[PDB]
Amino acid sequence: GLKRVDVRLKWDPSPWDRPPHHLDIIATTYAADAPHGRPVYVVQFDKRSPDGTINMSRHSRTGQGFGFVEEMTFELDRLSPSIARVIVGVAIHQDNGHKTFDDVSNTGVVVAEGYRELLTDGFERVAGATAATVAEFTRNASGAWEFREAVRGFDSDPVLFATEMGSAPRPG
Numbered sequence: 141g142l143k144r145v146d147v148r149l150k151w152d153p154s155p156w157d158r159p160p161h162h163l164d165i166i167a168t169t170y171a172a173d174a175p176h177g178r179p180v181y182v183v184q185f186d187k188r189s190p191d192g193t194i195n196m197s198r199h200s201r202t203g204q205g206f207g208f209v210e211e212m213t214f215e216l217d218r219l220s221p222s223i224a225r226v227i228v229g230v231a232i233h234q235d236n237g238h239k240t241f242d243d244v245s246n247t248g249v250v251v252a253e254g255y256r257e258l259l260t261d262g263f264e265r266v267a268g269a270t271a272a273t274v275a276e277f278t279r280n281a282s283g284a285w286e287f288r289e290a291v292r293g294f295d296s297d298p299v300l301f302a303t304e305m306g307s308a309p310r311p312g
């Protein structure tokens with residue numbers, strides 16, 4: 141299955157007219173015995189993975205730079221056997237007022253394994269959301285990691301999003 145995977149995120153900064161656009165890639169890990177329970181831990185710009193298996197070589201609180209301004213790399217194959225699910229998403233900071241993906245120009249994410257593209261998205265499906273999951277990694281019976289597209293919108297701020305981003309969706 142997948143051995144290592146990365147997530148890169150781009151977005152445009154805000155007009156001189158407005159407070160910064162602060163977006164974060166956020167991931168959570170889930171125990172084999174509770175794939176949809178509480179996160180085992182949360183990974184984002186200000187919180188490293190405790191096991192060293194996830195890194196961010198860059199991150200941004202503004203989107204000022206050009207291209208992919210934030211990235212998170214996962215060495216899935218190096219995760220404890222007791223972790224069997226990972227979910228990664230993107231959250232918009234809400235401290236300058238209610239702000240969705242539709243409010244922020246050229247928001248984009250790419251999920252890849254090296255040179256194999258897994259997902260590219262502009263968050264069009266979740267225009268009204270303050271935060272969104274984009275991808276799920278889960279282990280096989282044989283223990284190999286698999287990817288699934290998991291683009292789903294949420295209405296929470298970044299901290300609340302992390303608590304709920306792994307919960308079982310509603311069937312439909």
Ligand code: NA
Nearest residue numbers: 163164200201
């Ligand atoms: Na950020």
Ligand code: NA
Nearest residue numbers: 151152203205
């Ligand atoms: Na940018």
Ligand code: NA
Nearest residue numbers: 241242244247
């Ligand atoms: Na957008």
